[PDB]
Amino acid sequence: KMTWRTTRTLLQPQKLDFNEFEILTPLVEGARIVGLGEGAHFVAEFSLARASLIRYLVERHDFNAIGLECGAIQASRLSEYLNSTAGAHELERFSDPLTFSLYGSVLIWIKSYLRESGRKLQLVGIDLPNTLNPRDDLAQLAEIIKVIDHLIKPHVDELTHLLASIDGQSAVISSAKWGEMETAQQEKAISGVTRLKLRLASLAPVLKKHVNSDLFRKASDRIESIEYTLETLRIMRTFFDGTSLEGDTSVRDSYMAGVVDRMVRANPDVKIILLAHNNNLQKTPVSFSGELTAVPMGQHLAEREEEDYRAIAFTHLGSTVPEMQFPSPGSPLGFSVVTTPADAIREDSMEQYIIDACGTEDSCLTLTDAPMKAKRMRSQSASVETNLSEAFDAIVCVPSAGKDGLVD
C-alpha cells in the first residue's frame, strides 16, 4: 500500500493547512527542481492546486523561481507585470493570448501574493516562444551582435526578413505560415541559424571579451531559442503532413530540458518550481498506445547526476475535462477549449487507485513509492500508459476538472 493524504484545503490558497503537505518534505528534501503538473491545460482546480503548492514550496522550502511554458522574452514581460504597481498594470498588456490562457489565474494570484507577502520570485521562461514566433529572439539577437559581432548583423537582419512571415499567436498558426514558405526558404533559414550558432560558438573566447561577458551568453540563448523554434515549426508541419517520424515531438522537450539544466547550475542557489503539463514533467517516454510519442523534458532532467529533480503530476476524477479542439476557425489561437468526456477510469488507472484509497469528494495527495497495478493516467482527454512509480514522484488528484474561468 502507499503513502496518501487527503488535503481538503488544497484547492483554497488563502486558507491552507501545510501539515496536509508534510508528506512532501521527504522528496522536496535535496531537490532543486520540482514540477507542478496538470493533467490537462485550462483547468481551474489545477490552477488552485498549483497556487497552493507554490505557496507551500516557497514558504516551507525556499523556492525562489517559477518556470513557465513561455519563451524568456515572454517571461521578462511577465516579470514587468509582476513588479509593476503602476497605473493600468493589467496582465492583458504584458502577456499574449496563449500565455494568458495557460497561466492567467496563477499569474494574477502570484502578483497579488507577492504584494501581500513581500516575498519576491524570479519568473523564468523555460520554453520556446509559445507562439513559435522568432521575431523577438531575432531582434534582441541583432541588438546584441551589433555590439559583439557587427560583421554578421547583415545575416541576422536577412534572417529576420526571411522569417518575418511567421507572426502567429499560437503554435498551429505559425506552423501553418511556416508550411506556406517554399522549402528552399525554410532550408535557407535553418542552415543560416546553424551557421550563426557555429560562428558564435567558435568565437566565444573573444566575443565574451566585448562589453560584458553576459551579452554573448544572451546571444547564444537567443540562437538556441531560434534554432529549436524553426525545428519545432518543421516537425509540426510534418505532423499534419504524415511525414511525422515517431519521436520527433521530443525536440521541444529537449530544448526545455537544456534550458532548465543550463540555468540551474549557472545559478546554483535557485530552487525552481516548474509549471508544465504532466506529459512534460514526466520521467519516462510518453506513450498513449505503446508508441513512443516523445521523450519528456523530465526524462532528460532525471538523468541529471545531482538527483534533485522531482515530478508531481496532477490528475482528477471528474467525468469531463477541457480539451483542445483543432481546428477552430476565427479563434485567436487556431484551437478552442471544449468540455469533453474524460477518458474512462479502468482497473489499471491511477485514478481508480485514487478512488479506492481516498474517495471521490476530497482532493488527495500520494507518493508513488510502492508497486502497483496502475499502468495508466488521464492526460488531456486520453491517457498515457507508463510505469507510474518511475514516471512521477507524487500524484495530486482533485475531484473534478472544470474549465478555468478566464479562458475564452
Author numbering: 10 to 417
Recite the paper's sentences.
EreC is an extremely close homologue of EreA, displaying more than 90% sequence identity. Crystal form I, determined to a resolution of 2.0 Å, has one molecule per asymmetric unit, and crystal form II was resolved to 2.4 Å and has two molecules of EreC per asymmetric unit. Both crystal forms show that the protein can be divided into two parts, a major and a minor lobe. The major lobe makes up the greater portion of the protein and is composed of 8 β-strands (β1–6, β9, and β12) forming a continuous sheet, surrounded by α-helices and loops.
We determined the three-dimensional structure of EreC H289N in two different crystal forms. Most of the EreC structure is effectively identical in the two crystal forms, as is reflected in pairwise RMSD values of 0.25–0.41 Å between the three crystallographically independent EreC molecules. However, there is a notable difference in a loop between residues 295 and 303. In crystal form II, the loop is directed away from the rest of the enzyme, and we have called this the open configuration (EreCOpen). Not unexpectantly, electron density corresponding to erythromycin could not be explicitly identified in either of the two structures. We selected a water molecule present in the close vicinity of catalytic residues (H50, E78, and H289) that is conserved in both the open and closed conformations of the enzyme, strongly suggesting it is the second substrate in the hydrolysis reaction. By comparing EreCOpen and EreCClosed, in conjunction with the docking results, we were able to identify a loop rich in glycine and proline, which is capable of closing over the active site. We hypothesize that this flexible loop closes upon substrate binding and returns to the open conformation after reaction completion, to ready the active site for another cycle of catalysis.
